[PDB]
Amino acid sequence: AFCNLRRCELSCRSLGLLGKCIGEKCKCVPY
Numbered sequence: 873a874f875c876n877l878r879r880c881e882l883s884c885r886s887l888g889l890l891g892k893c894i895g896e897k898c899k900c901v902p903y
Contacts, residue, residue: 873897 873896880891880898889900 873893875893875896875898877891877893877898880893880900882891883898884891884900887900889903891898891900
């Protein structure tokens with residue numbers, strides 16, 4: 873579970889979204 877929540881949020885900034893750790897990895901949450 874190499875989740876990096878600060879990097880996850882900063883990746884979703886490029887789409888304008890929020891970022892969450894899904895269990896093992898990061899995903900952006902739909903707006």
